[PDB]
Ligand binder design. Structure first.
Ligand SMILES: CC(C)(COP(=O)(O)OP(=O)(O)OC[C@H]1O[C@@H](n2cnc3c(N)ncnc32)[C@H](O)[C@@H]1OP(=O)(O)O)[C@@H](O)C(=O)NCCC(=O)NCCS
Ligand SMILES: CC(C)(COP(=O)(O)OP(=O)(O)OC[C@H]1O[C@@H](n2cnc3c(N)ncnc32)[C@H](O)[C@@H]1OP(=O)(O)O)[C@@H](O)C(=O)NCCC(=O)NCCS
Ligand SMILES: [Zn+2]
Ligand SMILES: [Zn+2]
Lengths: 305, 305
């Protein structure tokens, strides 16, 4: 019988991770339109943008107007990505429902991406919590959890130390991110099992990129050891411009199709999501790495010759 | 400790499944060159071509000359795909080491692909065995095992009945093929577990296409219940021209990378295979769906800015 604990919670990040690396600018009102459409698909969380330097990520420099302009569904948490105190204050002014703080477990990647050390990142996070606790809610992301494109292997003890530091600040919602798609299923089971001894399945998000084709295999491996919250991008958009060779997030409609075929519950309308994904080539001017947008679902049968 | 039973046996099908649907003709001597290169990569089996109607599959109409021209490595079985007695006789004349007989579990797909019923296909197989048993060796493939692009759901009892019919002819090596990428991991575990009560892991091949992005997830699910032999195509080439919307086989180098990262043994040289896959765009005039050819393996690190 279906159990409350079975639900896989699909969280949408195409407006942020998807668009930050897209070659072409997406106009502000079309970003708003995309989020308004995603808001009809069943997601509990949508990462609607970032509050970062416009010199670093020019594609997301309209975050304030995007957050101002979208239709707020009462049962959706609209998340903004935050690197420091200045971004946190911007996000609160824009009434982001949740601030997603981000640093990398790799010192080299944190310097390349945030232009500061991990210690400096956490110094900012401490000030953010001191000023804004009780005025908003927080998520703590550890990027390059499963390896780094610069440093290679990443110490799992260091990942856990960073998670514990988030907890010490009272931030118990945690994302582990595979920024350049370096994770494998055995490694995922080991890391997720250990982090789930610190926090609960309601608190842990896994954020996989599909750079080496293991994205959905890693989702299922994490699910098998109890993880339930997963980030994905419509059409398989995404990648970080400062992680070399980064590529798309796992594709939302491919993830939802996997769940639907296996029997894992989601609250996402798959048919409607595929239709929305198929509008992306016209919006962006190129095709996207979505298998379901190309092929359709199993029940899309073909006429007999 | 490493066990004899742990090895995942990677079997290469790009010269047949990969090329049959490619838009452009690959010249005969370049087909031979490709197989000669694949023969250096560690495969125990390479499907070097087909002996089918040139009206049906014009891209593979040079099968006799390909089999004549390749360098035969003594420890590799060169397989030819066979639909009927005429093709079997051609394959024996070309000294194929193994004849891969194919029919579909879907009557509609078998008629579309082979222009005969399943009963007619097995009538041919019976004559093939009667004439050529003891002169060659056989594999029996059941296509559309996991669903059909025309009929939709496919009876698992019917799949098992077809496997049993192969066994009655003395053909105990069996391939279950997911022709248009309709399989999911739970279904795979159920079907593979049952077939492994009839034949051994040394006898069963799984042949997955990646049409809905579940190819490697289905491989790992099959491996978890004891399957060990898997077909894959270099660069993710492949698809059947008579199965509508068919798309690539699972990508060989993505499969081998998954094994290498998890710790599943293979006998494939991954570095050399990636280098070979990266020659495909120049050969075919377009890029291929290989994640590893695009991104490189984890240990390909990037310079610090
Ligand atoms: C963290 C970050 C802001 C540091 O950049 P920096 O230029 O070294 O930061 P400094 O504080 O030295 O620069 C200060 C300037 O940037 C502005 N700035 C600082 N933080 C900002 C923020 N969060 N949003 C917007 N502007 C910001 C300051 O107001 C100031 O503007 P000025 O030039 O007119 O004075 C930048 O590296 C960044 O935005 N990184 C995130 C990139 C990203 O999102 N990557 C992908 C997802 S992780
Ligand atoms: C099975 C198949 C040969 C039946 O085709 P068909 O045209 O209905 O077959 P017929 O026996 O009625 O046609 C006989 C003609 O084809 C030839 N032929 C029959 N089987 C052949 C074979 N295996 N190889 C080459 N020629 C063959 C006959 O010699 C004859 O040639 P002719 O026209 O000069 O007389 C054809 O459907 C086929 O090759 N299908 C396989 C397609 C495939 O490989 N799909 C993807 C992988 S499953
Ligand atoms: Zn990301
Ligand atoms: Zn195939």
């Amino acid at each position: 019988m279906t159990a409350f604990s079975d639900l896989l919670v699909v969280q949408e990040v195409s407006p942020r991770d998807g668009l930050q690396i897209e070659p072409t600018w997406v106009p502000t009102d079309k970003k708003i339109d995309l989020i308004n459409q995603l808001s009809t698909m069943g997601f509990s969380r949508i990462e609607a943008g970032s509050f970062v330097s416009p010199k670093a990520i020019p594609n997301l420099r309209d975050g304030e107007e995007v957050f101002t302009g979208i239709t707020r569904h009462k049962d959706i948490i609209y998340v903004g990505l935050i690197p420091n105190l200045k971004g946190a204050l911007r996000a609160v002014e824009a009434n982001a429902n949740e601030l997603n703080l981000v640093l990398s477990a790799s010192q080299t990647h944190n310097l390349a991406n945030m232009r500061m050390t991990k210690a400096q990142s956490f110094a900012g996070f401490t000030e953010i919590v001191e000023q804004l606790q009780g005025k908003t809610q927080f998520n703590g992301t550890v990027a390059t959890t499963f390896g780094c494109p610069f440093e290679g292997k990443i110490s799992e003890r260091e990942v856990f130390s960073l998670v514990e530091h988030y907890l010490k600040l009272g931030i118990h919602n945690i994302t582990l991110a595979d920024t350049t798609g370096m994770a494998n299923p055995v490694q995922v089971k080991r890391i997720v099992s250990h982090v789930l001894s610190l926090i609960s399945p309601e608190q842990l998000t896994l954020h996989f990129h599909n750079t080496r084709g293991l994205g959905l295999t890693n989702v299922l491996a994490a699910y098998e050891v109890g993880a339930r919250r997963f980030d994905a991008a419509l059409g398989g958009l995404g990648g970080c411009p400062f992680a070399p060779g980064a590529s798309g997030n796992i594709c939302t409609e491919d993830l939802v199709n996997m769940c639907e075929e296996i029997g894992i519950p989601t609250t996402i309308d798959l048919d409607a999501l595929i239709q929305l994904s198929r509008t992306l080539p016209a919006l962006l001017g190129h095709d996207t790495p979505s298998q379901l947008a190309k092929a359709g679902r199993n029940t899309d049968l073909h006429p007999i010759p």
